Design a protein around this ligand. Structure first.
Ligand SMILES: Nc1ncnc2c1ncn2[C@@H]1O[C@H](C[C@@H](N)CC[C@H](N)C(=O)O)[C@@H](O)[C@H]1O
Ligand SMILES: Nc1ncnc2c1ncn2[C@@H]1O[C@H](C[C@@H](N)CC[C@H](N)C(=O)O)[C@@H](O)[C@H]1O
Lengths: 344, 7, 343, 6
């Protein structure tokens, strides 16, 4: 019926689009200054990729990126938005007197019609850990509207992963789960659920930020080129790694962040969510190992991170790792859809 | 929430 | 089922998912006032459980069914629709109560029980009492209730009182006014000003506050669970007449609720009032997008109207007027989209 | 969130 509805449980989609229907949620993204400001810079400083061009904005939300394409001289911008935010975008197009130049199209990019092909697709479809929400697939799907040799902004995306040590983060999981380790909570022995409580906490990726000192080796990266990639390429994402340990300690899990590059005619501009960069609404994400691993500087931490896309607009994450010198091993399964938002 | 709160 | 007919599958799926998490059961369990008061209610009324048949509506961990067992119940059917049912079963085994507690997975609207019960226990209260529409499931369960059977809780009082809190008003107002900017990165947002205010003020505010902010004695609306039918809760109409005790700006209405367990031995109250120790229900405030000016001695009158929707919640309208000036405020609130403000 | 975190 639709590529979107095929890969998506209606229940997930309803919530998803209701969330984006809220002005406050659009506002939450807009106020991310690093995010919004870099998009603006990327577009305006590459004004020749936009001047008198035809543009598609995939998931326009408020319209903000389409207004930036207009500030850069675009002739015609089709702004597609699946949520009821489309109605609000439309109100802005009129009140900013850009009816001749921005056409808001309510609906899913997998289901609407465009009148013509475009020179360039712009989007902000990045979830935490890059891939969450599965909107990158919508963005790739949109290339069916892209004129041969058209461009995409952003053009490529890099995921970085790196091992970390954070003993307190690790212990918090047990302190939380040990609520259940009591033989008489109002006369009830809860102990038998302690293991299930631990498993539940460890299945949640942790969204928050951290001092770079916790990282124990230089990151490995996995790159998606949005010009070349097919939707199908994001269904099963396998990220091998061989870390060369810069520091000795207990490895408690892997940390994830991402960068995107806008590769324009005039310049490449980068948007980075790295822990070395000022903070964004994406923070960073950490996947704990339920059994941590000891490594000494010079050892190799090798393994695989596998993300398997699911019908709830997220991924099932599987991380397997070992210290090559000792053979000690840790396996972990996480649900990217249900992160723990730890940050204050 | 797909996108974390931010300020 | 009666359930699926009033519930969007999309809402249901998310609802029971949330309660399937041990962390969320733990959140409620750890509310000492809530869990301890349910325990006192049940154990202090032991003769209402002693050698009786009990239904626990939405048993979660099993916690209330254990209290019913501690009080000597012969048999307890512990109904739960989330995956928490499997964890309840584990606890029933690990506590050697397989002979007395019988977990039944499913919605109480959809399961079958082998017999009628003497008493129904549940913890079905949402914030502002009615959120989640689980009171309707609890009343639905009376089909299993023996004639002259009891309900624990037995009654529910919702309290409302007008408040003044200009800091709250401005906090919400300031967020809305993001959309008053005529040149956000060169873009004029200002045409969505009114839509933004509407959306922010649609959000009920969940947190606590000092009783000094209340401007009149509270109005009380009661629901008797022993007597109410499910359909009574589809459209809830609460009229009010406040005799204003202080002059100043009325920023909205504050809501809290009490429940009473009317036992054969004693009545035990569980209150979420702001004069009492805090619970995980906190309190709820519905802000007016424009405050009403009142003088001590004036009357503030109108109606709060709760219309059940298929997202397991309520469309709320609060029309309030200061009789002495004809100044009015009409408001619509989306009880499913609250703002959790508490530090 | 049906129930607010305590
Ligand atoms: N398949 C889809 N079709 C159309 N719109 C979508 C789709 N998936 C997500 N969206 C919308 O994409 C937007 C994603 C936001 N990150 C971006 C909003 C806006 N472009 C901004 O940069 O501020 C949300 O408003 C979603 O409702
Ligand atoms: N229609 C329904 N049928 C069965 N269980 C339900 C229904 N609606 C809500 N629930 C469950 O009722 C529980 C509500 C909890 N507030 C109470 C848990 C437990 N009785 C306690 O007091 O700790 C949740 O576990 C829900 O999954």
């Amino acid at each position: 019926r639709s590529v979107f509805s095929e890969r998506t449980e209606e229940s997930s989609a309803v919530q998803y689009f209701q969330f984006y229907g809220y002005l406050s949620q659009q506002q939450n993204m807009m106020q991310d200054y690093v995010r919004t400001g870099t998009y603006q810079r990327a577009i305006l400083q590459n004004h020749t990729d936009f001047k008198d061009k035809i543009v598609l904005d995939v998931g326009c939300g408020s319209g903000i990126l389409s207004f930036f394409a207009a500030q850069a001289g675009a002739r015609k911008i089709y702004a597609v938005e699946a949520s009821t935010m489309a109605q609000h975008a439309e109100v802005l197009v009129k009140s900013n007197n850009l009816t001749d130049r921005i056409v808001v199209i309510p609906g899913k990019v997998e289901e609407v019609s465009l009148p013509e092909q475009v020179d360039i697709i712009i989007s902000e479809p990045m979830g935490y850990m890059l891939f969450n929400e599965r909107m990158l697939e919508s963005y790739l799907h949109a290339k069916k509207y892209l004129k041969p040799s058209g461009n995409m902004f952003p053009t490529i995306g890099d995921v970085h992963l790196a091992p970390f040590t954070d003993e307190q983060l690790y212990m918090e999981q047990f302190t939380k789960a040990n609520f259940w380790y009591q033989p008489s909570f109002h006369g009830v022995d809860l102990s038998a659920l302690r293991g299930a409580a631990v498993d539940e906490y460890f299945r949640q990726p942790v969204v928050d930020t951290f001092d770079i000192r916790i990282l124990m080796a230089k990151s490995v990266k996995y790159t998606v080129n949005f010009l070349e990639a097919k939707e199908g390429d994001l269904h099963r994402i396998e990220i091998p790694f061989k870390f060369h340990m810069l520091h000795s300690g207990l490895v408690h899990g892997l940390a994830f962040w991402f960068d995107v590059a806008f590769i324009g005619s005039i310049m490449t501009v980068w948007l980075s969510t790295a822990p070395t960069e000022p903070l964004t609404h994406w923070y960073q994400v950490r996947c704990l190992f339920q059994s941590p691993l000891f490594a000494k500087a010079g050892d190799t931490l090798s393994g695989t991170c596998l993300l398997i896309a699911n019908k709830r607009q997220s991924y099932d994450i599987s991380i397997v790792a070992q210290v090559d010198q000792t053979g000690s091993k840790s396996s972990n399964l996480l649900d990217l859809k249900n992160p723990f938002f730890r940050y204050t | 929430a797909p996108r974390p709160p931010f300020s």
